[PDB]
Design a protein around this ligand. Structure first.
Ligand code: CLA
Ligand code: CLA
Ligand code: CLA
Ligand code: CLA
Ligand code: CLA
Ligand SMILES: CCCCCCCCCCCCCCCC(=O)OC[C@H](COP(=O)(O)OC[C@@H](O)CO)OC(=O)CCCCCCCCCCCCCCC
Ligand SMILES: CC1=C(/C=C/C(C)=C/C=C/C(C)=C/C=C/C=C(C)/C=C/C=C(C)/C=C/C2=C(C)CCCC2(C)C)C(C)(C)CCC1
Ligand SMILES: CCCCCCCS[C@@H]1O[C@H](CO)[C@@H](O)[C@H](O)[C@H]1O
Lengths: 122, 51
């Protein structure tokens, strides 16, 4: 029942991050003496907003919608890194490697194209 | 012969060609409206309806 490449190729699922059941409302214990890592971090963008640039700097600018024109090529995935337990009990993720960038072009109303390097590098 | 300012009077007793002339005029006016709108769209800046 596990899906293979040929089940997935061309469907768009390859650009989608995994989801968890609605039953996944638990808790993962952290032992401050154990070391941890994130074996896989996946980020799937669903919305790109671009801040408009107004002529009068008194007017507050807003984020407007855009149309993605570079197809299902946007997600960051296979990202891994150390997950530190800090002395105050907080956790710090330190990204080390992975597919941690995607060039993306979105288009504003009126046709202006906005390329960006969607990323979480370092 | 007809002087230059009377050439179109040949339509007076020709209903079919009068319709043809009226059709042609209608085509030119509708074509102007389309051309005019396209030219405006090529020049219109939509980014500031305030100023
Ligand atoms: C609505 C427009 C229109 C229509 C439906 C008619 C219809 C008619 N004309 Mg008339 N005519 C018109 C406008 C029109 N004319 C204009 C503007 C002029 C001055 C040039 C004339 C001068 C004229 C003469 C001398 C004669 C007719 C005649 C006739 C009849 C036969 C067709 C013909 O020979 O045309 C003639 C051909 C034209 C008028 C072509 C006009 C070209 C225009 C001015 C330029 C268009 C070029 C291009 C598309 C745009 C340039 C843009 C620029 C930025 C480069 C027919 C009833 C004939 C007739 O039956 O007489 C008894 C005839 O001898 N017309
Ligand atoms: C619906 C409006 C309309 C219609 C269907 C007509 C139709 C006619 N007119 Mg009349 N006329 C009109 C309005 C109209 N006119 C208006 C508003 C005026 C005052 C300007 C006149 C003054 C007038 C005179 C003094 C005469 C006519 C004559 C005629 C007859 C022959 C025209 C001809 O062959 O010209 C051919 C025209 C050309 C070959 C070139 C004309 C070029 C003009 C001057 C400049 C360019 C015009 C431009 C291309 C068009 C855009 C127009 C738009 C902005 C309105 C024909 C029945 C004649 C007649 O009675 O014959 C027996 C005649 O002597 N008309
Ligand atoms: C009862 C049916 C009927 C209908 C529906 C019309 C309608 C029209 N006639 Mg009139 N007419 C009629 C009876 C009718 N007439 C009779 C019995 C006579 C005596 C023979 C006339 C003599 C007459 C003359 C001399 C002229 C008209 C013109 C016009 C048109 C002016 C508006 C225009 O061009 O808009 C712009 C056009 C549109 C928005 C397109 C509309 C969709 C079209 C009508 C589809 C055409 C398909 C159809 C199968 C073709 C035949 C149409 C015909 C039955 C009217 C309009 C379509 C004028 C004209 O044709 O100018 C260009 C014109 O000069 N009529
Ligand atoms: C209600 C609206 C309306 C009316 C009543 C008319 C009426 C007329 N148009 Mg049409 N036209 C219209 C809207 C209208 N137009 C629109 C919105 C467009 C798109 C821009 C046109 C584009 C158009 C074209 C291309 C032509 C007409 C022509 C005509 C004339 C055909 C009958 C004729 O033989 O006159 C005889 C001519 C006259 C009576 C002369 C009228 C003079 C007008 C009123 C002022 C022009 C003065 C001055 C010389 C203009 C210089 C322009 C120059 C610098 C380029 C008639 C006067 C045709 C024409 O004039 O054929 C000769 C013609 O070729 N019209
Ligand atoms: C299905 C047909 C259709 C439709 C839905 C449209 C729709 C449109 N037109 Mg186009 N057009 C058409 C056919 C059509 N057009 C045809 C056949 C021509 C060539 C004649 C044009 C030439 C044209 C031009 C030149 C322009 C448009 C424009 C427009 C836009 C503004 C309309 C407007 O302000 O009208 C206003 C309409 C009136 C004020 C109607 C006046 C009616 C008079 C008063 C009637 C008087 C006689 C009547 C018999 C009296 C008795 C009435 C009785 C009830 C008592 C709108 C998108 C405008 C635009 O934005 O272009 C991009 C524009 O400039 N159209
Ligand atoms: C065909 C209709 C054209 C009329 C256009 C009139 C526009 C002026 C406004 C009305 C003034 C009224 C005076 C009427 C006086 C009057 O009643 O005349 C009436 C006359 C017809 O009268 P008749 O049938 O009795 O003819 C008398 C002839 O035998 C002459 O002797 O009409 C004309 O002459 C039409 C030509 C005028 C043309 C004027 C010059 C137009 C040139 C335009 C230049 C365009 C350049 C374009 C660049 C791209
Ligand atoms: C065929 C066909 C087709 C096509 C069509 C087309 C493409 C059309 C176009 C059309 C057009 C594109 C048109 C245009 C027109 C224009 C006009 C008509 C103009 C006129 C002008 C005038 C008249 C002016 C005058 C003046 C001057 C010049 C100066 C100032 C003053 C005054 C204003 C007086 C199709 C595909 C649909 C299909 C079916 C068949
Ligand atoms: C009916 C033929 C239409 C041909 C042109 C249709 C494109 S639509 C065109 O697109 C541009 C870029 O997005 C805009 O800047 C402009 O406002 C708009 O009119």
């Amino acid at each position: 029942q596990t899906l293979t490449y040929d089940d997935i190729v061309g469907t768009g699922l390859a650009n989608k991050c995994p989801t968890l059941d609605d039953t996944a409302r638990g808790a993962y214990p952290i032992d401050s003496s154990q070391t941890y890592r994130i074996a896989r971090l996946c980020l799937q963008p669903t919305t790109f907003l671009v801040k408009e640039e107004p002529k009068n700097k008194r007017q507050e600018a807003e984020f407007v919608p855009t149309k993605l024109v570079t197809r299902e090529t946007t997600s960051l995935d296979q990202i891994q890194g150390e997950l530190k337990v800090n002395s105050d009990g907080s956790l710090t993720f330190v990204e080390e490697d992975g597919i941690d960038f995607q060039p993306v072009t979105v288009q504003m109303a009126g046709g202006e194209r906005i390329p960006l390097l969607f990323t979480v590098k370092n | 012969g007809l002087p230059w300012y009377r050439v179109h009077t040949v339509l007076i007793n020709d209903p079919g060609r009068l319709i043809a002339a009226h059709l042609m005029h209608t085509a030119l006016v509708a074509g102007w409206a389309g051309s005019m709108a396209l030219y405006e769209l090529a020049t219109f800046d939509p980014s500031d309806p305030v100023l």
